[PDB]
C-alpha cells in the first residue's frame, strides 16, 4: 500500500523569545498511518508534559496531529521537536528557528 | 447530529 | 467561504490492534474550522465529549443519543475491517485504517446545498456517495462487491434523508448557537524578515488564506516558498511566504477576514 511521510513544522504559537507566555507546537501532518510518535526537546531533553490535538484527516485522507506544551521561552532556551513514523528509518529531529 | 444508520460492506 | 457557506463535517478512523484488543476508533466533529465534539474508543466515559463552548449548551437528551449513535460505528466498522481482509484476501496480522467522512454543506442563507458519504481503507478510496446523492463510487474490484449490495439494500436512500435533514438542522442550530464564536472572522498578522526575506500571517481565522508574491506588479513563482497553513492552538492558524536582489519584491496577502489584500513594504 502506499505509506506517506509525516509533514513536521515545530514553531511557536504566539510571537515571541523573551519571558511573554506561549506555547510550543509540533504540527505533524500529510502522514499515513495514524501511529505517530511526537517528542517536544528541549536542550536534547524529553519535556513530560506534551498535549496533543484529536487524530483528524485531510481531503486526501491523510492525517495531521499538533501537538503543544506550555512554555515561556527566552532568548537562549532552545527546543526541539523529535518524530518517528513506520515511513522513518531513524527518528528525524527538527529544531525549533524562528 | 450523527448519523444513525450504519451499514456493512 | 467566500460564498458565505458554512460546513458540517464527522470524521472517522478505526485502526485495528492484531493481537493487542479491539481496534482503536476515532472520531471528531467539526463545524467548517472549529472542532465540536470527540469520541475515542480508549477513552473511559464511553461516550459523546464537547470539545467547543456552544455545544454544551445542547441538552442533556442530544449526549446520550450522540453518544449511542458513534459507538454503532465504531462497532459497524469493526466488522466493516473484517470484511475488507475477506474482499483484499489479507491476513489477521496486518494493521489497516478504515476512515470515513459525512456531513453536508448550507449557505449563507442556511438552505442543503451538498451531502458527504465517503469511505476510504488503507488510506484511498473505497466507496463514497456520489453527488446525486443516489449512486456510488467504487474505487476497486472489493468495493463493487459493496456498492452491489448497497444499491439492493438501497442505501442511498437511507444516507440523502440523513444528509438532507438531521444533517442540516444541526449545522443550523450549532451554526447560530456559535454565533458569537462561528459567524466571525480574525484577520492576519503581517510581519516581514530578511536573510542574507519572508513575509508572515498569523493569529488568522478561517484558515483560507492566500499569499502571493509579484516582483514590480509581476506574479512570481521562482524562488518561492510557501508552507502549509498551520494551527497555534488557539482557534487561528499561521503561514508564511518567501522569496543583495531586494526592495523590488512585495509580498501580496488575500483573506476573507482582511478589509483589503495587504501589501508586504520590505
Not at chain 3, 37 to 56: L, T, Y
Not at chain 3, 115 to 139: C, F, N, P, V
Not at chain 3, 184 to 190: G, I, L
Amino acid at each position: 500500500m502506499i505509506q506517506r511521510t509525516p509533514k513536521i513544522q515545530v514553531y511557536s504559537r504566539h510571537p515571541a523569545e523573551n519571558g511573554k507566555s506561549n506555547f510550543l507546537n509540533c504540527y505533524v501532518s500529510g502522514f499515513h498511518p495514524s501511529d505517530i510518535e511526537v517528542d517536544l526537546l528541549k536542550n536534547g531533553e524529553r519535556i513530560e508534559k506534551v498535549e496533543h490535538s484529536d487524530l483528524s484527516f485531510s481531503k486526501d485522507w491523510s492525517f495531521y496531529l499538533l501537538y503543544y506544551t506550555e512554555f515561556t521561552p527566552t532568548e537562549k532556551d532552545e527546543y526541539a521537536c523529535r518524530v518517528n513514523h513506520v515511513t522513518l528509518s531513524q527518528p528525524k529531529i527538527v529544531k525549533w528557528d524562528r | 447530529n450523527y448519523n444513525y444508520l450504519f451499514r456493512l460492506f | 467561504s467566500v460564498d458565505g457557506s458554512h460546513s458540517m463535517r464527522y470524521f472517522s478512523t478505526s485502526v485495528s490492534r492484531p493481537g493487542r484488543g479491539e481496534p482503536r476508533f476515532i472520531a471528531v466533529g467539526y463545524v467548517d474550522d472549529t472542532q465540536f465534539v470527540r469520541f475515542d474508543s480508549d477513552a473511559a466515559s464511553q461516550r459523546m465529549e464537547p470539545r467547543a463552548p456552544w455545544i454544551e449548551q445542547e441538552g442533556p437528551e442530544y449526549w446520550d443519543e450522540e453518544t449511542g449513535k458513534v459507538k454503532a460505528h465504531s462497532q459497524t466498522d469493526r466488522e466493516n475491517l473484517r470484511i475488507a481482509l475477506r474482499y483484499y484476501n489479507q491476513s489477521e496480522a496486518g494493521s489497516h485504517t478504515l476512515q470515513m467522512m459525512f456531513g453536508c454543506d448550507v449557505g449563507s442563507d442556511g438552505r442543503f446545498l451538498r451531502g458527504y458519504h465517503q469511505y476510504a481503507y488503507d488510506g484511498k478510496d473505497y466507496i463514497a456517495l456520489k453527488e446525486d446523492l443516489r449512486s456510488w463510487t467504487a474505487a476497486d474490484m472489493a468495493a463493487q462487491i459493496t456498492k452491489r449490495k448497497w444499491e439492493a439494500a438501497h442505501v442511498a436512500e437511507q444516507q440523502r434523508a440523513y444528509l438532507e435533514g438531521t444533517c442540516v438542522d444541526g449545522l443550523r442550530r450549532y451554526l447560530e448557537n456559535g454565533k458569537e464564536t462561528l459567524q466571525r472572522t480574525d484577520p492576519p498578522k503581517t510581519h516581514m524578515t530578511h536573510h542574507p526575506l519572508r513575509c508572515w500571517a498569523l493569529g488568522f481565522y478561517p484558515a483560507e488564506i492566500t499569499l502571493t508574491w509579484q516582483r514590480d506588479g509581476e506574479d512570481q513563482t521562482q524562488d518561492t516558498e510557501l508552507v502549509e497553513t498551520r494551527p497555534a492552538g488557539d482557534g487561528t492558524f499561521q503561514k508564511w511566504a518567501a522569496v543583495g536582489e531586494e526592495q523590488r519584491y512585495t509580498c501580496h496577502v488575500q483573506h476573507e477576514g482582511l478589509p483589503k489584500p495587504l501589501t508586504l513594504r520590505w
